[PDB]
Design an enzyme around this catalytic site. Structure first.
Site, PDB file in Angstrom:
ATOM      1  N   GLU A  35      19.432 -20.612  -2.761  1.00  0.00           N
ATOM      2  CA  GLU A  35      20.756 -20.019  -2.867  1.00  0.00           C
ATOM      3  C   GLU A  35      20.924 -18.800  -1.973  1.00  0.00           C
ATOM      4  O   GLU A  35      21.886 -18.707  -1.231  1.00  0.00           O
ATOM      5  CB  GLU A  35      21.078 -19.601  -4.304  1.00  0.00           C
ATOM      6  CG  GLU A  35      21.329 -20.751  -5.270  1.00  0.00           C
ATOM      7  CD  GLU A  35      22.538 -21.614  -4.924  1.00  0.00           C
ATOM      8  OE1 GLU A  35      23.410 -21.178  -4.140  1.00  0.00           O
ATOM      9  OE2 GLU A  35      22.623 -22.737  -5.470  1.00  0.00           O
ATOM     10  N   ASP A  49      38.687 -22.710  -1.275  1.00  0.00           N
ATOM     11  CA  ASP A  49      39.295 -22.438  -2.568  1.00  0.00           C
ATOM     12  C   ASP A  49      39.472 -20.972  -2.915  1.00  0.00           C
ATOM     13  O   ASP A  49      39.792 -20.646  -4.050  1.00  0.00           O
ATOM     14  CB  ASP A  49      38.544 -23.173  -3.688  1.00  0.00           C
ATOM     15  CG  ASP A  49      37.190 -22.559  -4.016  1.00  0.00           C
ATOM     16  OD1 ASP A  49      36.660 -21.747  -3.237  1.00  0.00           O
ATOM     17  OD2 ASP A  49      36.650 -22.902  -5.081  1.00  0.00           O
ATOM     18  N   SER A  51      37.281 -18.610  -3.339  1.00  0.00           N
ATOM     19  CA  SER A  51      36.293 -18.021  -4.225  1.00  0.00           C
ATOM     20  C   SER A  51      35.121 -17.526  -3.377  1.00  0.00           C
ATOM     21  O   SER A  51      34.968 -17.945  -2.231  1.00  0.00           O
ATOM     22  CB  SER A  51      35.812 -19.048  -5.251  1.00  0.00           C
ATOM     23  OG  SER A  51      34.979 -20.034  -4.662  1.00  0.00           O
ATOM     24  N   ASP A  53      30.753 -16.498  -3.568  1.00  0.00           N
ATOM     25  CA  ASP A  53      29.483 -16.568  -4.299  1.00  0.00           C
ATOM     26  C   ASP A  53      28.761 -15.230  -4.111  1.00  0.00           C
ATOM     27  O   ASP A  53      28.616 -14.752  -2.981  1.00  0.00           O
ATOM     28  CB  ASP A  53      28.626 -17.709  -3.760  1.00  0.00           C
ATOM     29  CG  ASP A  53      29.256 -19.067  -3.996  1.00  0.00           C
ATOM     30  OD1 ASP A  53      29.965 -19.227  -5.005  1.00  0.00           O
ATOM     31  OD2 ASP A  53      29.045 -19.969  -3.165  1.00  0.00           O
TER      32      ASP A  53
END
Length: 130
Positions: A35, A49, A51, A53
């Site tokens: 990640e 979208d 958003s 992380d």
């Protein structure tokens, strides 16, 4: 902060991640590796979208933390996304624990499925003393 492998393994163990909701420490290590590369300040914008992380486990602003600019977002971890960018990972860990309390568990992260599921993950904790 960019953690060294064993340093992170010992930190996660102390924070009670080993076996949390049935997830072994080596699975959490594999997840953080893919990640963010063990980088606490890692951020990634999803233009598709709106958003973003945040942090070592790349928790999304639509569901887990609040950044104020993500449409239709909830804040399940009840934290500002800024809290997920600290060198101290206590909050990021508390939020990751919240994520896996949902039915999908560790599967909530797509990368875990692509890079860790059904693989030999022992390598991530070998030699770390955990």
């Amino acid at each position: 902060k960019v953690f060294e492998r064993c340093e992170l393994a010992r930190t996660l163990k102390r924070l009670g991640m080993d076996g949390y909701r049935g997830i072994s420490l080596a699975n959490w290590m594999c997840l953080a590796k893919w990640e963010s590369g063990y980088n606490t300040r890692a951020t990634n914008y999803n233009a598709g979208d709106r958003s973003t992380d945040y942090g070592i486990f790349q928790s999304n602003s639509r569901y887990w933390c609040n950044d104020g600019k993500t449409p239709g977002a909830v804040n399940a971890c009840h934290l500002s996304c800024s809290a997920l960018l600290q060198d101290n990972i206590a909050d990021a860990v508390a939020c990751a624990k919240r994520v896996v309390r949902d039915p999908q568990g560790i599967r909530a992260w797509v990368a875990w499925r692509n890079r860790c599921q059904n693989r030999d993950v022992r390598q991530y904790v070998q030699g770390c003393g955990v």
